[PDB]
Write an enzyme that holds these catalytic residues in place. Structure first.
Site, short mmCIF file in Angstrom:
data_model
loop_
_atom_site.label_atom_id
_atom_site.label_comp_id
_atom_site.label_asym_id
_atom_site.label_seq_id
_atom_site.Cartn_x
_atom_site.Cartn_y
_atom_site.Cartn_z
N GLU A 35 0.74 -1.07 0.10
CA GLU A 35 -0.14 -0.14 -0.01
C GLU A 35 0.93 1.22 -0.20
OE1 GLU A 35 -2.93 0.21 -0.54
OE2 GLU A 35 -3.98 -1.64 -0.18
N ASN A 46 -7.79 9.78 -5.36
CA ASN A 46 -8.67 9.03 -6.43
C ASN A 46 -9.64 9.95 -7.11
OD1 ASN A 46 -7.55 6.24 -5.67
ND2 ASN A 46 -8.44 6.97 -3.71
N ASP A 49 -13.56 9.12 -7.88
CA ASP A 49 -14.56 9.24 -6.95
C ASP A 49 -14.20 10.42 -5.87
OD1 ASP A 49 -12.70 8.02 -5.17
OD2 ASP A 49 -14.25 6.53 -4.53
N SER A 51 -12.42 10.50 -3.54
CA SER A 51 -11.73 10.22 -2.31
C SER A 51 -10.21 10.18 -2.15
CB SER A 51 -12.36 8.73 -2.02
OG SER A 51 -11.57 7.68 -2.91
N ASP A 53 -6.74 7.97 -0.39
CA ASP A 53 -6.23 6.98 0.52
C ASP A 53 -5.37 7.58 1.66
OD1 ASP A 53 -7.73 5.13 -0.91
OD2 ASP A 53 -6.11 5.10 -2.48
N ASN A 60 -9.16 4.58 2.98
CA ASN A 60 -9.87 5.31 2.00
C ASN A 60 -11.03 6.17 2.90
OD1 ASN A 60 -12.43 5.78 -0.24
ND2 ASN A 60 -10.37 5.78 -1.04
#
Ligand code: NDG
Length: 130
Positions: A35, A46, A49, A51, A53, A60
């Site tokens: 990750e 992102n 959408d 969002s 991380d 998220n």
């Protein structure tokens, strides 16, 4: 901070992650490696959408933490996403534990499916004393 491998393994063990909801330490280490490269300050936006991380586990904002700027989001870990960018990973670990209390468990992170599932993950904890 960027953890060294075995330092992180022992840190996660002291925080109660070895076998949490059936998930071995080596699986948590595989997750953190892929990750974020063991990096607590990592963020990934992102655009699809809106969002983001956050942190060493790249948790998220759509579901798990609040950053105020993700539309139609919830905050199941009841934390500011800022909490997931600390050098101290206690809050991130509490949130990761919350994630895997839901049905998917460790499969909640797609990268775990691609990088860790049905794989030999023992290398991530070799030599660390865990
Ligand atoms: C536990 C967690 O943060 N899971 C999220 C997931 O829900 C999301 O849909 C995906 C998209 O970037 O990123 C992460 O895998």
């Amino acid at each position: 901070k960027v953890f060294e491998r075995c330092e992180l393994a022992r840190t996660l063990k002291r925080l109660g992650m070895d076998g949490y909801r059936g998930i071995s330490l080596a699986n948590w280490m595989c997750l953190a490696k892929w990750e974020s490269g063991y990096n607590t300050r990592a963020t990934n936006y992102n655009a699809g959408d809106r969002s983001t991380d956050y942190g060493i586990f790249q948790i998220n904002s759509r579901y798990w933490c609040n950053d105020g700027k993700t539309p139609g989001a919830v905050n199941a870990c009841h934390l500011s996403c800022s909490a997931l960018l600390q050098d101290n990973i206690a809050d991130a670990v509490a949130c990761a534990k919350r994630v895997v209390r839901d049905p998917q468990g460790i499969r909640a992170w797609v990268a775990w499916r691609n990088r860790c599932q049905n794989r030999d993950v023992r290398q991530y904890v070799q030599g660390c004393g865990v």
